[PDB]
Write a protein that binds this ligand. Structure first.
Ligand SMILES: COC(=O)Nc1ccc(S(=O)(=O)C(C)C)c([C@H]2CCCN2C(=O)[C@H](Nc2ccc3c(c2)C(=O)NCC3)c2ccc(OC)c(OC)c2)c1
Ligand SMILES: [Ca+2]
Lengths: 55, 254
């Protein structure tokens, strides 16, 4: 599943038993109930530009 | 950076400036509060390991505005496979003596997972390359942080599109080509160790390190970057390690 369009994940993707797929996030982010989207849990998460995010 | 533009202050917040005795050495990328990733070739001629400084939040080299943060580089970690004076395995992991403070001007770039990086990031065409390197081949270095958008090539295409030059190193599986063959836009020697940053679904990631080429913005030639995805496990294992005495440390690769 992960092989194609990142298994629908925003960040990381893990394959399991058959057609089971788990999305995950980098440290400083948590996964939303949709199971694909990652939301920041910290003030300065990695790979996001505060001055651009604050517009 | 040749053919780029000035990176607006705070839009390359993970960019590191490496200094030795106060002099411009290389670039680097911040991946968390205490680790910086740069190029192994940046440290080939170092004798004064205690005079290595990493500057975060830097933009204009002529003025101090208060957003700059200086830290001593406490450890330089290089792969066992890297040979000084050569091109392959061009990566260095730097441990800051004390953490940097995350602010609007100092933010890490995400070190991605190998899988994600190889099967998703490796296919994003364009990426940003940045530094205070020379503005032209045999030209003066920039006083303001410069940024350039460059397209990534598959190695087969790079080798086909390039002008067959002798003694020119091979493009290994630990490298990738990115840039332009028309002599208009490139990264340069002074940008060495700097980030090649990839955008994916609202977040930026570390895909490459400014490594080498056949002259800055040479026609028929692209810029060569260290393929960071190959070093994810190697970096992670070391960031989980306790500091060891001595600045330079050579670590087994793989
Ligand atoms: C063969 O190995 C070397 O040349 N090694 C080595 C060890 C140390 C230094 S240094 O001490 O000046 C340091 C402070 C940067 C250096 C310095 C001095 C001589 C050139 N140089 C570079 O740093 C080049 N950097 C560089 C980076 C990106 C690009 C280009 C050039 C380029 O020409 N075109 C576009 C992309 C360089 C060129 C050619 C190389 O190999 C063929 C190479 O390999 C690493 C590195 C080079
Ligand atoms: Ca400054």
């Amino acid at each position: 599943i992960c092989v194609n369009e990142n298994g629908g994940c925003e960040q990381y993707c893990s394959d399991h038993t058959g057609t089971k797929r788990s999305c995950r996030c980098h440290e400083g982010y948590s996964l939303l109930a949709d199971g694909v989207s990652c939301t920041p849990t910290v003030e300065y998460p990695c790979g996001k530009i505060p001055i651009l995010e604050k517009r | 950076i040749v053919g780029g533009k000035v990176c607006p202050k705070g839009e390359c917040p993970w960019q590191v400036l490496l200094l030795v005795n106060g002099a411009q050495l290389c670039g680097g990328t911040l991946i968390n509060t205490i680790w910086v990733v740069s190029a192994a070739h940046c440290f080939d001629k170092i004798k004064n390991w205690r005079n290595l400084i990493a500057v975060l939040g830097e933009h204009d080299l002529s003025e101090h505005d208060g957003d700059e943060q200086s830290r001593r580089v406490a450890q330089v970690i290089i792969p066992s496979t890297y040979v000084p004076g050569t091109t392959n395995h061009d990566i260095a992991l730097l441990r800051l003596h004390q953490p940097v403070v995350l602010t609007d001007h100092v933010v890490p770039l995400c070190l991605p997972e190998r899988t994600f990086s190889e099967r998703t990031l490796a296919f994003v065409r364009f990426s940003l390359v940045s530094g205070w390197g020379q503005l032209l081949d045999r030209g003066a270095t920039a006083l303001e942080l410069m940024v350039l958008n460059v397209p990534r090539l598959m190695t087969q295409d790079c080798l086909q599109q390039s002008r067959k030059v002798g003694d020119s190193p091979n493009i290994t599986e630990y490298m990738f080509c990115a840039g332009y063959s028309d002599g208009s836009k490139d990264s340069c020697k002074g940008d060495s160790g700097g980030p090649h940053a990839t955008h994916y679904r609202g977040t930026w990631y570390l895909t490459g390190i400014v490594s080498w080429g056949q002259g800055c913005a040479t026609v028929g030639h692209f810029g060569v970057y260290t393929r960071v995805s190959q070093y994810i496990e190697w970096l992670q294992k070391l960031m989980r390690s306790e500091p060891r005495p001595g600045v330079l440390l050579r670590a087994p690769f793989p």
